[PDB]
């Protein structure tokens, strides 16, 4: 849903060498937190997607904390993302240079 920026009011996608310097683990809130790392030539809104695909073809989850620019070429913002109950993949970027990671989220009858 809202896990791609925000349509025709935000800017692109970093595709230079992207991690996780924190992967996306569940914080028992409905929510998985991680911290993610921009090295060189990539001027970007912050890409971190929550998708039916390993590759983030679909854009399945929402945002809960802010999506700002990287601040330098070495920048690395925080972030928490809400899949739905069931099944995610977390991908952090765009192009070749984007991580996956897999995520399960309990059912909406224990909220957490």
């Known amino acids: 849903m809202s896990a791609l920026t925000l349509k025709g009011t935000s800017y692109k ?4 060498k992207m991690s996780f310097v924190k992967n996306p ?4 809130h409905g929510t998985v937190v991680m911290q993610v790392k921009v090295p060189k030539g990539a ?3 912050i890409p971190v997607i929550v998708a039916d695909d390993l590759t983030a073809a679909i854009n399945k989850g929402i945002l ?3 999506n ?3 601040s ?3 920048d690395e913002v925080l972030i928490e ?3 739905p109950f069931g099944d995610s993949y977390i991908i952090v970027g ?3 240079s984007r991580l996956t990671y897999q995520w399960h989220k309990e059912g909406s009858s224990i909220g957490k």
């Open 13 to 16: 996608m970093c595709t230079d």
């Open 25 to 28: 683990t569940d914080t028992g």
């Open 43 to 45: 001027p970007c809104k």
């Open 64 to 66: 809960v904390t802010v």
């Open 68 to 70: 700002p620019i990287a």
């Open 72 to 74: 330098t070429n070495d």
């Open 81 to 83: 993302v809400n899949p």
């Open 94 to 96: 765009t192009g070749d």
